[PDB]
Design a protein around this ligand. Structure first.
Ligand code: CA
Ligand code: CL
Length: 210
């Protein structure tokens, strides 16, 4: 199975790519039968390891700023939907500062007989309240999610300068209408420094490097 990773790091966010990437190579879908493609939307002229690893697909993306950079997240993915349909069976979006800390495998893949969607519980809320930092699914289902959310944003994009929507309320509305096949615990979006019962699986990195 071909697993596509969607990753936006415009502007100063590109600093998070190297360790996200290294941790993914170490921990994400370790079983060599899986083939991972990285789709990295950035204004950076060159990403770490890009010259060595052709699974790293740098996609040219203008730096956007509030509200657009997260508000237009799904618009950004859809620019290459044709490429994504031909090259992937699954798609997962990870916020720039996420870091894998332990092995993740096929348990996060929505089965083909499900609605094909994955969402993640917001760590602050531990009918779920979903966080925007991690979502995904089979390629066809996730692209339908993108198209739907894109349509909602576009309703206001011209006439409303101040947005009504935010990427997070958008994903919560989507998952309300379409309860995802898989809902991951906040262990997959564990804010560094927080007191939560479980062990972190994916960490939201804070500002201090070890
Ligand atoms: Ca830290
Ligand atoms: Cl691999």
């Amino acid at each position: 199975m071909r697993i596509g990773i969607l990753y936006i790091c415009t502007g100063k966010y590109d600093i998070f790519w190297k360790d996200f990437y290294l941790s993914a190579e170490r921990y994400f879908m370790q079983d060599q039968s899986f083939i991972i493609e990285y789709y990295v939307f950035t204004d950076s002229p060159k990403l770490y390891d890009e010259e060595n690893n052709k699974h790293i697909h740098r996609i040219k993306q203008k730096n956007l700023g509030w509200p657009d950079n997260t508000l237009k997240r799904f618009h950004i993915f859809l620019r290459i939907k044709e490429q994504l349909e031909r090259e992937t069976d699954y798609l997962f979006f990870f916020n720039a500062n996420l870091l894998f800390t332990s092995p993740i495998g096929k348990e996060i893949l929505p089965p083909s007989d499900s609605n094909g969607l994955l969402g993640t519980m917001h760590p602050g809320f531990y009918r779920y309240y979903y966080a925007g930092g991690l979502s995904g699914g089979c390629t066809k289902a996730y692209l339908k999610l993108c198209t739907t959310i894109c349509s909602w944003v576009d309703r206001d994009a011209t006439n409303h300068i101040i947005p009504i929507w935010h990427d997070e309320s958008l994903i919560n509305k989507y998952f309300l209408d379409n309860p995802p096949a898989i809902t991951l615990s906040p262990a997959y979006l564990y804010p560094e420094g927080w007191l939560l019962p479980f062990e972190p699986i994916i960490l939201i990195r804070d500002k201090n490097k070890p």
